[PDB]
């Protein structure tokens, strides 16, 4: 129908789990559809358009931490996590995470390390945990994560833990790190090349650059509507500001840092991810709406930043768990410097 | 059956077109199950495996050029070439294939422009026709491909060609080009990194290089039997010296240069190349015995190496046909220097 009038409908919670994943569903359908073209000649042509107009490419509510714990795992992961098996539980799919992005970005003991985008810490506070002789430092642009990391520190007696609270794009420094660890948060960058480029003046010969990204297998896309159809892409992100790429668009970014590994996660870790966020939002619920009361006002309020997050849940599902997570996934890159 | 078998029968000539081609679409066939993963995770693996080993990697007779000219186009290319159209001729499509090149390499009057394993010199001899003011270089491993150049080049009253007779792999210069060009060469490279490498001091800031090599759209493998049914693989290339890239192989190897754009051309490109050698040989069959004969010195040795060339046009056929172009094909990059 209308989309003012599906939007209104959800919002009165007046669509069932049922209807909203079999919509959510058929918009990501038809992004495939937008996506896979029918030769290799026409996927490069189209894949290579994308990779060059990226290359042309040159805040005051945050939900409180209480809220974050009821709805997220243990370390308030904000990224795919991995789970090994259907009974794993999101505290045991963050530490797997962690542990993964360890092996694979060869952290050892002793080596600096810069966590981009750190978001709640999790992976920081891990890395501090496990290699006692490192030095872990986040980076994020949020006050109040930067204080909730340093709380945690301090709370697990951590010594060799450091945050700096800046906007990447615009930080600047003489600084160089042993190991740099992006996770999630390229997603999020306007300029690519400018970052990468960034990134590779805080490396030596030495280091090593680690990004982890949400991708689709064979195309890149903005996380914005195709038709007047789609009331979800701009639903979850009312902003133009994130950037699916494929799984090897990142291959083409190899100006200032050179590949050396490469890997994808399938969609159903993301999944289980997100379902698992979703049930413990409802679990929660009535806990959730006293959190959120405070800061937001009044019940109306509550009720439709609940309804966004749940439905951001409840789409995420239908796109990572496609095709039994044989479209979008996450993808993983190991770099050194040029 | 049994191989030699098989083998016996092909040199006497018993196995009609139609087993033949069946019988080799099934080796493809087996190889697509070879290469192709149920998993982007899976396929990620297996590729990165191959690339990975490639990255640990450290004659006598020659067919007469009468001969020459009497299978291959009026140029004598030796590699896929570009059909318009069903009835475009080999000479309109080896034409047509140089034009491409020289677009999408961005060859401009007044460059100096090196070949790498320029064969017969189709390509050197229409750059230095079509660019009076370029400088055009040939390098070749073989002396008579040199002589056949010049010659030419004499022919055709062109003063702007010379040939650098070199094992390309051993070929030490300070001399840097403004463009460089890899026509289906890098497939025979044992180094390919340090090929890459060895192209990129020979490149100057304003330098471009451009490669185009036979593909797999998915993944890579060396031309070579699987198992012991494979009686094709051995028999077209006795030994093990050529790789078939993926589509994307290269991307992994920007050590030394930066890619700026990346295509694939269609199969079915390759087919109908390999189908116009096959057929113009069926057609000059009684002369090409002729010319053979002198240098073979009997008339088995002459069919032997006429069933070896057309067998391989065959194969070829079945091979880039294969799903009507979107299998193996040819893929081509453009890149700068790091
Ligand atoms: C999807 S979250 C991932 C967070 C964390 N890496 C994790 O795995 O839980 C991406 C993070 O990037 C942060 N971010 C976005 N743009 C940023 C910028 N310009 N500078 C710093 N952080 C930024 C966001 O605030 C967010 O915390
Ligand atoms: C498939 S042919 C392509 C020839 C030519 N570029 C064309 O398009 O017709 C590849 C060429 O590379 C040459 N070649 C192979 N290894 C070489 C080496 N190490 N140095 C120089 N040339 C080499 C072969 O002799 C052959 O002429
Ligand atoms: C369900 O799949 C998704 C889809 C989009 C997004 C996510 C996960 C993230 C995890 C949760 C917080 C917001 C995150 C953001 C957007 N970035 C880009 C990646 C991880
Ligand atoms: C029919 O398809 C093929 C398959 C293999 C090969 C070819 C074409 C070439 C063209 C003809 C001469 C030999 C060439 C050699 C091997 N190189 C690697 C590429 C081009």
Same mark, same amino acid.
């Given at each position: 129908? @209308?989309?003012?009038? !599906?939007?209104?409908?959800?919002?009165?919670?007046?669509?069932?789990?049922?209807?909203?994943?079999?919509?959510?569903?058929?918009?990501?359908?038809? %992004?495939?559809?937008?996506?896979?073209?029918?030769?290799?000649?026409?996927?490069? =042509?189209?894949?290579?358009?994308?990779?060059?107009?990226?290359?042309?490419? +040159?805040?005051?509510?945050?939900?409180?931490?209480?809220?974050?714990?009821? =709805?997220?795992?243990?370390?308030?992961? /904000?990224?795919? #996590?991995?789970?090994?098996?259907?009974?794993?539980?999101?505290?045991?799919?963050?530490?797997?995470?962690?542990?993964?992005? #360890?092996?694979?970005? /060869?952290?050892?003991?002793?080596?600096?390390? $810069?966590?981009?985008?750190?978001?709640?810490?999790?992976?920081?506070?891990? !890395?501090?945990?496990?290699?006692?002789?490192?030095?872990?430092?986040? $980076?994020?642009?949020?006050?109040?994560?930067?204080?909730?990391?340093?709380? /945690?520190?301090?709370?697990?007696?951590?010594?060799?833990?450091?945050? !700096?609270?800046?906007?990447?794009?615009?930080?600047?420094? +003489?600084?160089?790190?042993? %190991?740099?660890?992006?996770?999630?948060?390229?997603?999020?960058?306007?300029? !690519?090349?400018?970052?990468?480029?960034?990134? @590779?003046?805080?490396?030596?010969?030495?280091? $090593?650059?680690?990004? +982890?990204?949400?991708?689709?297998?064979?195309?890149?896309?903005?996380?914005?509507?195709?038709?007047?159809? &789609?009331?979800?892409?701009?639903?979850?992100?009312?902003?133009?500001?994130?950037?699916?790429?494929?799984?090897?668009?990142?291959?083409?970014?190899? &100006? &200032?840092?050179?590949?050396?590994?490469?890997?994808?996660?399938?969609?159903?870790?993301?999944?289980?991810?997100? +379902? =698992?966020? %979703?049930?413990?939002?409802?679990?929660?619920?009535?806990?959730?709406?006293?959190?959120? $009361?405070?800061?937001?006002?009044?019940?109306?309020?509550?009720?439709?930043?609940?309804?966004?997050?749940?439905?951001? #849940?409840?789409?995420?599902?239908?796109?990572?768990?496609?095709?039994?997570?044989?479209?979008?996934?996450?993808? /993983?890159?190991?770099?050194?410097?040029?």
């Amino acid at each position: 129908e @209308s989309i003012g009038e !599906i939007m209104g409908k959800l919002m009165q919670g007046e669509i069932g789990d049922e209807e909203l994943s079999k919509r959510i569903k058929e918009i990501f359908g038809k %992004r495939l559809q937008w996506g896979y073209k029918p030769t290799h000649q026409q996927q490069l =042509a189209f894949n290579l358009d994308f990779i060059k107009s990226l290359k042309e490419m +040159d805040e005051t509510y945050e939900l409180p931490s209480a809220f974050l714990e009821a =709805a997220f795992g243990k370390t308030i992961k /904000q990224s795919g #996590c991995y789970f090994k098996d259907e009974t794993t539980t999101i505290d045991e799919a963050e530490e797997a995470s962690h542990e993964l992005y #360890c092996e694979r970005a /060869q952290i050892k003991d002793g080596q600096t390390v $810069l966590d981009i985008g750190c978001g709640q810490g999790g992976l920081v506070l891990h !890395i501090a945990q496990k290699y006692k002789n490192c030095h872990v430092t986040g $980076l994020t642009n949020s006050k109040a994560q930067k204080n909730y990391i340093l709380m /945690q520190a301090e709370k697990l007696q951590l010594s060799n833990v450091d945050v !700096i609270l800046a906007d990447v794009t615009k930080h600047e420094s +003489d600084k160089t790190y042993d %190991r740099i660890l992006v996770i999630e948060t390229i997603e999020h960058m306007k300029n !690519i090349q400018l970052f990468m480029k960034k990134l @590779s003046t805080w490396m030596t010969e030495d280091s $090593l650059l680690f990004v +982890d990204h949400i991708c689709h297998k064979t195309f890149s896309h903005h996380f914005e509507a195709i038709d007047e159809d &789609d009331w979800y892409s701009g639903f979850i992100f009312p902003k133009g500001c994130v950037t699916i790429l494929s799984a090897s668009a990142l291959l083409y970014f190899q &100006d &200032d840092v050179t590949i050396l590994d490469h890997w994808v996660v399938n969609g159903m870790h993301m999944a289980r991810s997100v +379902d =698992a966020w %979703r049930k413990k939002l409802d679990k929660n619920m009535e806990l959730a709406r006293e959190i959120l $009361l405070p800061g937001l006002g009044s019940k109306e309020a509550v009720n439709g930043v609940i309804t966004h997050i749940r439905t951001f #849940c409840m789409g995420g599902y239908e796109q990572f768990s496609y095709n039994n997570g044989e479209e979008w996934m996450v993808a /993983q890159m190991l770099f050194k410097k040029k």
